[PDB]
Amino acid sequence: MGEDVFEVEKILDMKTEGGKVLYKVRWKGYTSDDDTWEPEIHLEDCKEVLLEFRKKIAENK
């Protein structure tokens, strides 16, 4: 895995801040109390959870 890399369960939400995109992450094996916002550069290996999220947002956009 590597320095502070963990498995993601799902992506819960997104937002932009300072021209940059962040995603709210639910860590696998963890609860809502550990959710963090993460910059895109942290999610290169989450293409699938990102699609599932971007998908659900289209499904009602």
Partner: peptide, 15 residues
Amino acid sequence: ARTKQTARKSTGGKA
């Protein structure tokens, strides 16, 4: 499921 979905977790943040 399908591949391993991983990411860097942030421990800091704006003060």
